[PDB]
C-alpha cells in the first residue's frame, strides 16, 4: 500500500492506544 | 594456404619479420592470427568457462553460448579472447582467433636481488573492468601464484612463477576478472621505472624499411 | 577528505565511531546483548535434552509437498517447548 496512508494508519492506531492506556493511567 | 592481405602479413610470410618484438615496438596493429601462429607456434590455448546468454523474442529465447579463451606460451606472452556464437565449437574457434589477435607481452621482473631468470613482476599493477579490481603484487621465489584458479592459469600461461593477488568486486564475473588481470599485466610495460629512463634512438619501422616487398 | 578524521590526536573519535558502527552489525549485537542466554531456548549450548510430548505432521513449504515428522519437546533445564525434526526414512517409529 501507499506509505503515506500506512503512516496515517499507524498514527490513528497510536492515538487509539494512547487513549485506551490513559483509561488506566 | 594463407594468402595474406596486409603489409605486415606479407612481410611475415616473406620472412623479414622473425620476432613479435618488432610488432610490439612499433605498435603495429595485428589483424591476421596467422601472423601470431607463425611467430609464436609454441603456445597453448585454454577455455575457462562456457556460459550461455539468451535473447527474448516473440517465440521463446535464442540462446547463444559465450566462450572465454586464454592463450599463451609460458615465456612472456598471453592473449585473451571472448566470443559469442550459436554453437560452442564455433565460439571456441573464433575465440582462439581473437585471443591470438589480442596477444600482448609481459614484463617479468625480480622481487629483489637480481639473481637469475625473472620469476615475478617488476611492479605492483592493478586492472579494472567493471566492478572488479584485480591487483598483482610481486612475490619472492617459491611462493607460487597466490591467486584464484583462472587467474593462476592466465599467469602460468604468461610465464609468471611467483606472484600475489588482491581482488575486489564481484569476482564471480569471470570475464571481468580476466579482462582486469589482462589489463593489469599489460600495464607492466606501461609503467616506467629507472632501468628504462635511458634514451634510445627510435628505430625505424619495417613498413618503411622493406616497403618494396610490401603491398605491391 | 574521505570523511573520517585523519589527524594524529583523533583516535578517540575513531574508537567511538567504531563502537557505534559495530552495533550496526548482527554478530556483535547478538553477542553482547546475550540473546543466546536470555532467549533462544537453549542457553547457547550446542545440544539439549528434552521430553517428548507429541508427534507432529508438519506440512512443507512451497514449492514442495510433504509431511516432515516432527516432535514437540519440553526441555529439561528450561521447560521450554520446541518443535524438532526426526531425520531419516521411518525414524519416527523410535520416538514413541
Amino acid at each position: 500500500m501507499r506509505a503515506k496512508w500506512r503512516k496515517k494508519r499507524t498514527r490513528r492506531l497510536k492515538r487509539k492506544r494512547r487513549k485506551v492506556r490513559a483509561r488506566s493511567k | 594456404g594463407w594468402v595474406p592481405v596486409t603489409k605486415l602479413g606479407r612481410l611475415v610470410k616473406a620472412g623479414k619479420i622473425t620476432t613479435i618484438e618488432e610488432i610490439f615496438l612499433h605498435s603495429l596493429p595485428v589483424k591476421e592470427f596467422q601472423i601470431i601462429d607463425t611467430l609464436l607456434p609454441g603456445l597453448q590455448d585454454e577455455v575457462m568457462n562456457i556460459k550461455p546468454v539468451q535473447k527474448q523474442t516473440r517465440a521463446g529465447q535464442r540462446t547463444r553460448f559465450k566462450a572465454v579463451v586464454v592463450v599463451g606460451d609460458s615465456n612472456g606472452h598471453v592473449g585473451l579472447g571472448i566470443k559469442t556464437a550459436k554453437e560452442v565449437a564455433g565460439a571456441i574457434r573464433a575465440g582462439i582467433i581473437i585471443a591470438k589477435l589480442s596477444v600482448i607481452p609481459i614484463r617479468r621482473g625480480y622481487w629483489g636481488t637480481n639473481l637469475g631468470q625473472p620469476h615475478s613482476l617488476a611492479t605492483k599493477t592493478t586492472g579494472k573492468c567493471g566492478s572488479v579490481t584485480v591487483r598483482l603484487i610481486p612475490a619472492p621465489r617459491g611462493s607460487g601464484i597466490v591467486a584464484s584458479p583462472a587467474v593462476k592459469k592466465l599467469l602460468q600461461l604468461a610465464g609468471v612463477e611467483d606472484v600475489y593477488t588482491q581482488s575486489n568486486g564481484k569476482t564471480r564475473t569471470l570475464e571481468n576478472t580476466l579482462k582486469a588481470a589482462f589489463v593489469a599485466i599489460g600495464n607492466t610495460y606501461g609503467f616506467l621505472t629507472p632501468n628504462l629512463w635511458a634514451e634510445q634512438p627510435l628505430p625505424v619501422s619495417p613498413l618503411d624499411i622493406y616497403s618494396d616487398e610490401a603491398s605491391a | 577528505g574521505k570523511g573520517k578524521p585523519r589527524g594524529l590526536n583523533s583516535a578517540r573519535k575513531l574508537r567511538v565511531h567504531r563502537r557505534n558502527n559495530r552495533w550496526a552489525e548482527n554478530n556483535y549485537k547478538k553477542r553482547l546483548l546475550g540473546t543466546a542466554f536470555k532467549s533462544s531456548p537453549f542457553g547457547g549450548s550446542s545440544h539439549a535434552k528434552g521430553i517428548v510430548l507429541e508427534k507432529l505432521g508438519i506440512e512443507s513449504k512451497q514449492p514442495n509437498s510433504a509431511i516432515r515428522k516432527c516432535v514437540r519437546v519440553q526441555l529439561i533445564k528450561n521447560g521450554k517447548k520446541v518443535t524438532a525434526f526426526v531425520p531419516n526414512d521411518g525414524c519416527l517409529n523410535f520416538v514413541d
Binding site: - | 603489409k7 612499433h26 589483424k31 618494396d212 603491398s215 | -
Partner: protein, 206 residues
C-alpha cells in the same frame, strides 16, 4: 637545417594573399593555434603566412620521406577540395579518396576501399573526422589543412589556411605538390615557377 632557398618568396606571398589564405576565421579561436598575427577589426584574424609556409615545407618533407608514394592518401569530402586532391594524386602517387570515405577503409581488410597507408592528408578535419578517427585505430599519422577553430585532435602536422575559401584549398594543395616534387627531384629548378597553374587545382560549379 635548411639552405635558406626554401624561405618565402614574394611570388608565393602574392599567391597566398590573393587567395586570402591569411584571412583566418573569426575571433572564435582554438587555443591550440598560436599561428595568429594581430587580429583584425571586422572581428577577423590574420594568419602568419610564414609559419604556413614552414609547416607546408615540413609536410612536404614528410611526404617525400615515404618510399612508396601510393601509401600517401588525400581526403576531401568538401566540395571545394575534391579536384585539388585528385590533381595532387595525378602529379604524385597519392592514392586519393574524394567525396565519401567509406567507414572501414583503413580497417576491415576485406573491404574494397581497403588502404594501408603510412600517412593521410585531409582538407578539413571537422568534415573528415571519420578518417582521422580511423587513423587513430591503426597507427597512422595525419596531415591537415586547418583554420583557427578546427578540431585538431588526433592531428599531427597542421597547415593554417582559410578552408572556408575556394582558392585557399587548391592553392595549398598545389604548393604542397610543388614542394614535394621539388624534393623528389622531378622539379630540378627550385627558383623556377612550375608551369602548371594554381587555378588547375580549383573547384568549378558546372
Amino acid at each position: 637545417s635548411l639552405p635558406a632557398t626554401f624561405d618565402l618568396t614574394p611570388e608565393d606571398a602574392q599567391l597566398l594573399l590573393a587567395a586570402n589564405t591569411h584571412l583566418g576565421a573569426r575571433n572564435v579561436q582554438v587555443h591550440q593555434e598560436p599561428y595568429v598575427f594581430n587580429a583584425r577589426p571586422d572581428g577577423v584574424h590574420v594568419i602568419n603566412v610564414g609559419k604556413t609556409w614552414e609547416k607546408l615545407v615540413l609536410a612536404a618533407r614528410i611526404i617525400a620521406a615515404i618510399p612508396n608514394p601510393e601509401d600517401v592518401v588525400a581526403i576531401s569530402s568538401r566540395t571545394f577540395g575534391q579536384r585539388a586532391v585528385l590533381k595532387f594524386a595525378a602529379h604524385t602517387g597519392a592514392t586519393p579518396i574524394a567525396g565519401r570515405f567509406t567507414p572501414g577503409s583503413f580497417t576491415n581488410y576485406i573491404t574494397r576501399s581497403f588502404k594501408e597507408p603510412r600517412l593521410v592528408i585531409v582538407t578539413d578535419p571537422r568534415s573528415d573526422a571519420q578518417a582521422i578517427k580511423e587513423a587513430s585505430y591503426v597507427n597512422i599519422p595525419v596531415i591537415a589543412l586547418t583554420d583557427l577553430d578546427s578540431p585538431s585532435e588526433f592531428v599531427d602536422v597542421a597547415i593554417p589556411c582559410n578552408n572556408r575559401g575556394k582558392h585557399s584549398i587548391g592553392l595549398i594543395w598545389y604548393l604542397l605538390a610543388r614542394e614535394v616534387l621539388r624534393l623528389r627531384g622531378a622539379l630540378v629548378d627550385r627558383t623556377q615557377p612550375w608551369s602548371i597553374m594554381p587555378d588547375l587545382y580549383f573547384y568549378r560549379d558546372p
